């Protein structure tokens, strides 16, 4: 039940991260370098713990 | 420098209903090399 809950936690936090990161970039509240920094960051951090 | 409005980097958001009387929210986004910028305008039929 830890693995079942943290799989939904890893997936929903990645989905929430990569819908505010694309929102902030398209609105323009973040730079192009910082958008590429936190896209490689979500690929490496928001993964199975 | 001056660039044309039909460039590949310009992305528009939504549609203007020319067939329907009403004001519409249309925002254009130009993806620069360093940041995307946004400017909204209202289009009344």
Largest interface: A-B, 8 and 8 residues
What shape does the CA trace of chain B take? elongated
Structural class of chain B: mainly beta
What's the helix-strand series of chain A? HH
How much helical structure, as a percent, in the residues of chain B? Answer: under 10%
> The biggest beta sheet of chain B, please?
3 strands, antiparallel
Distance between the termini of chain B: 33 Å
* Oligomer type: part of a larger assembly
Order of SSEs of chain B: EEE
Estimated share of beta-strand residues of chain B? over 45%
Number of discrete helical segments of chain B: 0
**Total strands of chain A:** 0
**Strand line-up of the largest beta sheet of chain B:** 1-2-3
Report the helical percentage of chain A: over 70%
Radius of gyration of chain B: 13 Å
Main sheet specs of chain A: none
Q: State the helix count of chain A.
A: 2
Shape of chain A: elongated
Provide the structure class of chain A: mainly alpha
| Radius of gyration of chain A, taken over Cα atoms and rounded to an integer in Å | 12 Å
Domain Ig-like (chain B): 1-45
Protein name (chain B): Ig-like domain-containing protein
Organism (chain B): Weissella oryzae (strain DSM 25784 / JCM 18191 / LMG 30913 / SG25)
Family (chain A): Belongs to the peptidase M27 family.
């Amino acid at each position: 039940k830890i693995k079942e809950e943290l799989d939904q936690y890893v997936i929903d936090s990645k989905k929430y991260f990569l819908d505010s990161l694309e929102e902030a970039y398209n609105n323009g509240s973040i730079s192009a370098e910082s958008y590429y920094k936190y896209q490689t960051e979500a690929r490496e951090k928001f993964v199975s713990p | 420098n001056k660039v044309d409005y039909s460039d590949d980097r310009i992305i528009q958001e939504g549609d203007v209903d020319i067939n329907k009387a009403g004001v519409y929210d249309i925002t254009f986004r130009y993806r620069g090399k360093f940041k995307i910028i946004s400017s909204s305008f209202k289009v009344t039929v």
